Amino acid sequence: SAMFNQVLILICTLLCLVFTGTCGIQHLERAGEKLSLFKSFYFCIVTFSTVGYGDVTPKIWPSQLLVVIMICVALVVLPLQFEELVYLWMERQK
């Protein structure tokens, strides 16, 4: 089942990115302005959902960039997998 396979890849990647985001915001903002993990989950899923509320964001030199870098990579990485998911839907139709 390829449909299944890429569904998995999507989920895996999402999970990975969420994890990287939690782990990303965890050690940094924990210094200057302390934030709970749920705030991170929020931010991550707020970034990959393309929402961007802005209640709390990075105020620090590296902190923004790191989030940014992860997004930029994600924004390339995001469609790769959606693109993938599309390819199978085309195979299923065939």
24 is in an annotated binding site: no
Look up residue 50 and give its DSSP letter: T
Read off the CATH number of the domain in which 75 is found: 1.10.287.70
Determine the structural domain holding residue 48 and report its residue range: 2-93
51: annotated binding-site residue? yes
Buried b (16+ CB within 10 A) or exposed e, 39-74: bbebbbebbbeeeeeeeeebeeeebeeebeebbeeb
Contact 41, 56 (CB under 8 A): no
Q: Can you list the alpha helix ranges (DSSP code H) found in 1-94?
A: 2-32, 37-48, 61-93
Residue 58 phi/psi, 5-degree rounding, is -75, 130
Rounded Cα distance between 22 and 54, Å, is: 17
How many domains, the chain? Answer: 1
